[PDB]
Amino acid sequence: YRRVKELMVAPEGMFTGQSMLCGVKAPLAIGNVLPLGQITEGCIVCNVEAKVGDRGTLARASGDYCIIISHNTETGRTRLKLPSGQKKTVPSSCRAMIGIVAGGGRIEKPVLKAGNSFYRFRGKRNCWPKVRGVARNPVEHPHGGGNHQHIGHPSTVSRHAPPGQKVGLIAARRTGRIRGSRAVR
RNA sequence: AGUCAGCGGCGAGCGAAGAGGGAUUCAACUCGUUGCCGAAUCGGGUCUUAUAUGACCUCGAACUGUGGCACCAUUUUUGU
RNA sequence: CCAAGAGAGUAGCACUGUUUGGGAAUGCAGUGUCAAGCCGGCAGGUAUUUGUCUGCCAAGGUUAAAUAUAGAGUAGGAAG
RNA sequence: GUUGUUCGGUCACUGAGCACAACGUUACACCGUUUUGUUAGGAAAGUGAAGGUGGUCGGCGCACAUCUCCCUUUUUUGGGGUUUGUGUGUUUUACCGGCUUAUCUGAAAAGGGGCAACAGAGAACCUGGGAUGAUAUUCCAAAAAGAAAUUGCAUGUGGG
RNA sequence: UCCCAACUGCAGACCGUACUCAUCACCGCAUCAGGUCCCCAAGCAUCGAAUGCUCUGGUAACAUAGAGAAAGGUACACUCAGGGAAGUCGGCAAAAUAGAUGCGUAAGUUCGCAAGAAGCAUUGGCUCUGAGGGCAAAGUGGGGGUCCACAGGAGGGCCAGUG
RNA sequence: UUUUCGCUUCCUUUUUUUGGUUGCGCACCUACAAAUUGCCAACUCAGAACUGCUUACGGCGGGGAAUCCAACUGUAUAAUUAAAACAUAGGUUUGUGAUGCAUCCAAGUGGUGUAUGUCGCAAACUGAUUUCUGCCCAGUGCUCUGAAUGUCAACGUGAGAG
RNA sequence: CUUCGGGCUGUGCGCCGUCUAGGCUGGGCAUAAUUGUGGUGUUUCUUUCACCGCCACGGGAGGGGUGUUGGUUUUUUAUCC
RNA sequence: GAACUACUGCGCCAACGGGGUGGGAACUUUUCGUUUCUUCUCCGGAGUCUUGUUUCGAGACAUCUGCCAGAUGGGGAGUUU
RNA sequence: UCAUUGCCCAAUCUUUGAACGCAAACGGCGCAUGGGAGAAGCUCUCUCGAGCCAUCCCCGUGCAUGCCACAUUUCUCAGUGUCG
RNA sequence: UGGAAAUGCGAAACACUUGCCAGGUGACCCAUCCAUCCUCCCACGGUGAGCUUUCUUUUCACCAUAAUCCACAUCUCCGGCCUUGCUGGGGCUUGGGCCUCUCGACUUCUCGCGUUACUCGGAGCGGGGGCUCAAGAUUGAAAAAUGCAGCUCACCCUACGUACUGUCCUUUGUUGUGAGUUCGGCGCAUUAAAGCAAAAACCUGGGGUG
RNA sequence: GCGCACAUUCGGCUCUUCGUGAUGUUUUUUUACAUUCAUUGCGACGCGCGGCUUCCAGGAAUGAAGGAGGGUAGUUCGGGGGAGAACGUACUGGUGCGUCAGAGGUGAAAUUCUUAGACCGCACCAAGACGAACUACAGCGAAGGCAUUCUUCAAGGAUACCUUCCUCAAUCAAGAACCAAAGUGUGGGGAUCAAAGAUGAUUAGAGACCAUUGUAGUCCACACUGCAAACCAUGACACCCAUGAAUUGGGGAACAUCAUUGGGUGCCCGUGUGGCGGCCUUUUGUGCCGACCCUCGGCCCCAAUUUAUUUAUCAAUUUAC
């Protein structure tokens, strides 16, 4: 033999190791890697870069894909739409692998029990169960004390806030029940 | 002189020098800006000489080491 | 027949701080700023301009001896 | 009074984890940091000359053996040659094969340093012993202890 | 080419090694009921590392002891008549609960339970019985034992035998 | 038994092909009972008798009916307190898309979230399911991309012997 | 700068002027032919399709396979399907 | 110069040519010359070239270059109450 | 020629150690070089024997790091710095 | 270097290199039962010891290590000469070959399923490898080991002799391994490396340069 | 009506042997010359016969098809459905400017917006929506419900037939499968309309009408639901009945032939080795031209399509293409 490998980051289900021949001299199989600009608007790509030379920062989580919503062929900029209500305009330049996360979030699933949560979080540093601010010793914490279960002051802070003075609900322009909608009306 | 120096909630509290007497001392010293220049006057090495010196390379060194001179002088200056 | 060959982002100044008994600043450090016709430069303890007058000539460069030893110093005495 | 070519440990491995170069500190004799990094961070296959061994071949010299062919004599005895077979020469050379001097070519990163496992990973012994006072899968040697296993390295012969 | 095998000859470092490893060798200040990881684990009953006695082993344990049968205690000691929580802050305490089996089981419920819900019933010994599996050759007849088949055996080994 | 079971003999067609024929074999228990029987075997449960008298070893869950409270299992104050506490799934909002956010740090090309990217992370609040979650934004915060000319430091800027 | 002259120059512009980038489409042309789309073979339609063209290159086994044994062998040689 | 992949579907890689020089071979009468081989050497691989940068990105602003200046600041400080 | 006398010049000085070949709860383990010793082999056939020499082991000493000078009168390189 | 094949061998020699080897070569959870090995108990026999008084079949004991082959006979062919050949276990894996399952079926299961024309199944073959065995051989019995006992100089020595014996077999009930991440778990998916085999490679040996 | 003289009657088409081996004859001819023809062979079909030989078989064996049922087959019809895509265009929100002293809303105004700058105009975007008048006692759909396009997908109906099929049915408890709005859970979803609410205003009161907005909803993905003056307040199925007057919606079938037949100096670069003339060239030939003429064709024109049924002929049975 003697080739070049072909496995890395996971999007949808080809079965592995596959001969994708790339750049724009990629054809356009799903997962295939073509420049996003040279991928046609409205197409669904996955893991687009952003930095360029990053192999997929964006949408680097499970489920998505992202949609190109624009080319600016004059500059060679492109406006792509982050899954989030959020557009990012990157150069049209950028690599991308055709498609979607084969994955599609477990988020839907109802989680069920503690144990599950235990196995769940584990790959990283430990971070859960989670107790709350209101008893967490005053000496280290803002929300301890009070001769019973409550909030002191508004949880709505200026962003700038000291650490130790800054936790919770940063500068919430609004909070609580979303009685309306955010962004455009 | 804990002072007429004086700092200082000017408070607390702080706070010195000069001189004199005196000890000790015959204590004093270079370079960089001056013509320094008949194959760097040098240095390292080498080799002589019993060391310098001699000598020769090396090649550190003319991007400057030597020597001379160093705002007290040189006589300022003029006796060129 | 004349020369006349003396230290710079340093000095200084602002600014900040720190620091000083040192006072409208004793220093230092940072930062910025940033000097010499050389009728010069520095100093002359109330800010200044302004002028004299008075003392030096910094910002590179070396230097016994008289002193210390203060707590844990080491060789060799003398003691109370 | 605790005996090991074999058991362990741990000759090396990786885990989490911890150099040095660098880069940070008023600050190496209090370091901080980094944890393989502003680093030029190490040697081949192959060739090739060379030398040296071994083979082959090829050539060459010697000898033995040889279907067959040519020669004297009445005929056998006798000779040569052939071709073939065999053996030999430190033959010669060509050619291999080897091997070393020797000469040229000739490697890139979570890895440019090295540790980190008395349980992972984890490389050779079994049973028996009229066997010790107290040790032994270690002590028991050749024969009745024996029988093993492995390494290293020789040696000849064998395969060659 | 000779090492692309064989066999054989010849030699094996280093470092550990006893014993203890715990109701005395560890660690509880301490010859401590506290603690302290690992291997092994019979017979019988039986649900069965249970409970229990036990084998094998080990203990023969030791843990000052004797002497004693009073008060008080303490004891993982009991028992109590009738009575049945009056007691008591309080059913704490203690006591009532059982195996299994069969039978049987209310509300409610998120449908899943609730449930040993509740509640019944049964449980010896003896002496027969039943049900409940595996393991061969379908399967057969006739003829021969007035022998029918051989390699196998015994006894005949005082006959002047033979090997 | 008008097909690809096979071959032999023979006949027929040209045939020593096929086809027919024959012998044998190939597929087809259509050989087929019962499986009789032989053997050995097991302690389970069950059954029944016989029998008589025992809360007896051992080991053996009290129950019911409601109120408050917490969903639950989980968690824990060494050494008073184990719960109505926390954790907890479940509920809800912010903040936030990398020259970032969050966040650690003496400092550095330092750190971590993140060997990662909104099905993401971060941040807090609420505390199973179920069901609902009113009114107030004046206050006090927060927020604002809001406004724009009040204010707000240095900072400059021009003005007297100095 | 430079005695007129030599010397040098600048500036402005203009200048030739090294040097890369070397598929594809059109053009011209060798290409003879042929026209590597020409001519044949072939579908129902020219075409297609198959070929050929024009032009090259390399092959065509044939006998071999039974110690005879008949036949066939010329045969103790050989065939004998 | 990568194809159905048009819907999924694995096997390309180290050891490579031509030129030009030097020697020889082979062949040529044949030196000349053909041919080959050897030795050597050079060069080539839809470029080559290269004053000008690794590439991107960014950009004379963000970078807070760093330093002041101010606001803000129980996060902490310290003290007092 | 006493003296574990005295003095002292003369020397030794493990194992360590800043501690440095590497390393490290290991007398671990290396790396260059020298040196030693020796079953086997070999050889000498010396008969024995002896020697010689190998596999094998040991010891000595280098070998850490930085910085500093230097090299035959040059040590070897590198570089789009740079010469025509 | 063998056999259509599954798959073969004293040596078919062939080492660097491989943007080389989804290469169990290290490598991996638990998990499941089940299957069986192992071991283990029971018990039968049978021995040997020891027990055992009104009664008995009582008690105990009765063994075999690593390390290595797998050649005995069937059959060849029962041994003339035995010559094809060396054919020949179980019982899990897979494969391979023939036939080609279809009117659907088979099909294997304790388990959740599966399969088949994507070739079942069935046969026959090849091999994988727990295991077990196989003439079981070696090992190995031999002072084996164990238990006895008879004698013995002497037996109260001794040396602990010396000599002798016996020293066994079916058979019931526990557990390695069955290889995965092998039954479930699973918003969970079960270290790594050194460490090894293999391949590709194929340069050598089967060659006269010039 | 039947047979009949000849195929030399209109006429069939190989039943004027066929096919092929081929030869021959042909030789400015329909080349060559298969069958015919001449030579002859094999096959030979037609048709006949002949030999049969062998084997083998229904007619209607299996009523009769509902103005019963069921299909089937044929164009096609419809806002039927379902998946697509494309858009028109607006509402907005937004942008981007332009400007500008007013906007805006209203019973009355009032709450709104205002010179950052409101509106406004135009450009343009973004967004989500909606298919506007068309388009109507008009279509389709079980019902609910259903309107750009294309792209589809699979569906339905009707109509058509001499298609097959033999009651196939009917209607129907239980029982299933549907059911607008809205709600309801899980997710979109954001624009608007607007329940909740909030504001005005109003009122006597008024949180009501009315205004001004504005939260849930709304659309949708996705579920689920069953309640809707869910009205042809009218169960289904059946067989009938006025006039239909007009007019309708889909389809079929009529429109004296769209295809056919007949007729022509009307025409024709028509055909055709015919003849002729004209013209080329070694080759009267061939090749080229002739509104040359001829056989035939074409176009064009013209004519006709009768044929056709009850009932005698006969009447008459069709409006026009």
XYZ file of C-alpha atoms (C1' of nucleotides) in Angstrom, chain D residues 2-5 7-9 53-55 97 136 151-154 157-160, chain E residues 1-19 37:
40
model
C 17.279 -16.008 55.461
C 21.735 -19.533 49.730
C 18.072 -18.538 43.437
C 21.418 -18.679 34.923
C 10.885 -16.480 41.947
C 10.152 -11.809 43.234
C 11.860 -6.923 42.949
C 37.394 -14.314 3.603
C 34.354 -17.794 1.304
C 31.854 -19.724 -3.069
C 28.627 -14.187 -2.411
C 14.719 -22.723 50.502
C 20.568 -17.004 27.867
C 25.035 -15.978 26.454
C 28.899 -17.606 24.045
C 31.725 -20.599 22.108
C 30.320 -31.883 12.996
C 26.153 -32.246 10.854
C 22.519 -29.573 7.400
C 26.556 -26.705 4.329
C 29.088 -18.455 -1.279
C 29.619 -21.365 3.799
C 25.641 -19.759 8.676
C 18.797 -19.014 5.256
C 18.423 -25.006 10.410
C 20.784 -29.039 13.699
C 23.270 -30.796 17.489
C 26.582 -30.292 20.615
C 30.447 -27.782 24.139
C 31.344 -24.196 27.227
C 29.707 -20.071 31.020
C 25.224 -17.157 33.641
C 24.629 -10.477 36.871
C 22.087 -7.327 40.052
C 19.265 -6.414 43.809
C 15.150 -9.288 47.684
C 14.849 -13.767 50.724
C 14.248 -15.091 58.725
C 10.181 -14.498 61.108
C -5.940 -3.960 52.191
